[PDB]
Design a protein around this ligand. Sequence first.
Ligand SMILES: C[S@@+](CC[C@H](N)C(=O)[O-])C[C@H]1O[C@@H](n2cnc3c(N)ncnc32)[C@H](O)[C@@H]1O
Ligand SMILES: C[S@@+](CC[C@H](N)C(=O)[O-])C[C@H]1O[C@@H](n2cnc3c(N)ncnc32)[C@H](O)[C@@H]1O
Lengths: 232, 234
Amino acid sequence: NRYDLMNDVMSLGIHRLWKDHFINKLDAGKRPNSTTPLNFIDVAGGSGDIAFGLLDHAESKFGDTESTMDIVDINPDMLKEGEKRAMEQGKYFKDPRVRFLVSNGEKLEEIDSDSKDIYTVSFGIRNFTDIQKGLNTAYRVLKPGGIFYCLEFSKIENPLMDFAYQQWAKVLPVMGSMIANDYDSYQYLVESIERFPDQETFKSMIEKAGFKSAGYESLTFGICAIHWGIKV
Amino acid sequence: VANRYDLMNDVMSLGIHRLWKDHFINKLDAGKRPNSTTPLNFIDVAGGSGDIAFGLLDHAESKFGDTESTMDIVDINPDMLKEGEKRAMEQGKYFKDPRVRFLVSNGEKLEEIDSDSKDIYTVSFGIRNFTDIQKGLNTAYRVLKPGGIFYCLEFSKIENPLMDFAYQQWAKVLPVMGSMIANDYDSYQYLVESIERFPDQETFKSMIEKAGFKSAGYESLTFGICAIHWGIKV
Ligand SMILES: C[S@@+](CC[C@H](N)C(=O)[O-])C[C@H]1O[C@@H](n2cnc3c(N)ncnc32)[C@H](O)[C@@H]1O
Ligand SMILES: C[S@@+](CC[C@H](N)C(=O)[O-])C[C@H]1O[C@@H](n2cnc3c(N)ncnc32)[C@H](O)[C@@H]1O
């Protein structure tokens, strides 16, 4: 919930709409005239907004109740909350299709090479101590024709909006400290967005990982962005 | 609609509003004691979603074993009360319960609520939206029994100058991000202005005393970003 709250606050809840757009744009899932089940992997899943979102979208639009989902997070306490959310909604709790896994996105040692059709990472890759290694691991995990999809904060192009965002980013750790004694969380959040490579640099890092037909779509003037790539 | 209100609460308090509400319920400490046989009559106003209402009944059950006290959840917005009924259904508690009623009504008048029928009156972050605050306080006095308790959780005036300074920068930038990210300057500016025009701790206390309440008082929370105000009928 700590990350849920910071995402709610930083984006004023609009991250929900970014996630809805992200899922609809990817448009992943087993088509009705096919019996091959897709193997999803959602890295840095946390409470599971994307993982459950992908599964829900695949069912309602395609009638897919076959595809498997691996939800991966480095933090066991963050993962548990995802499974805790799964029981209360009562849909993906104790489901053979859905696996919760404690693992580092830079390694993913438990995952087999060339085993996954769809890789997603949503607002998590910026927290990786090594972003490139995580991108290389993403490539390793996917099989030919596999789609990499990333939702993450980015660079705001417009100077006025960026200037307003910087002040927002300045006042957040101050307010987080005074009200919630949470300076470190908000400062690390703000600094992780600042350090993160812009739309073009990140695209190059995705290409450097080995992905082809790589591109991006800046959302809400580039406060965040959707990056993609296809294997081979 | 209720999601929108939960979001603005999270954003303005940075998620701390849940700690305010838990302190609010714990401080009130309401419920039929195990040495008593008389159930209490609760009224909750301007909280159709049920955050405080469900919390009050849960607390009374947990601490005292009180599973008999009645609760009237009152909101002017029918959409908010639908969500509360949806919450109660999905919760598996307080849905289709004779103890719990969901009622459409204006908090300034509470016409469907009889005089001297309630033991506890609670309003949480809703009274600042009342077009006339005094009318709401007078009505709260009317529905309460002798010995009835008025309890209020609402945004207030910050008493810590450094917290105030930080808040003023917050209040300026927040609606700007509202306009830029959410395409919604109005809601956030309206929220900031509704907090600004609300009476301070001493003024609101006076208004509660003008309603007729005795032994009135307040406790500032988080440097006075919000406050708990109370009053006892006779
Ligand atoms: C804001 S959340 C993202 C949750 C969810 N994907 C969303 O968009 O709301 C960040 C999550 O990434 C996880 N994380 C951070 N570093 C990681 C790493 N190296 N490998 C896997 N997960 C990581 C954190 O534990 C945290 O739960
Ligand atoms: C932000 S919410 C309250 C937040 C949360 N549900 C709680 O009680 O802590 C404000 C609520 O007060 C209600 N409200 C506003 N003006 C009112 C009035 N004059 N009478 C009754 N309810 C009112 C609104 O419909 C809205 O649902």
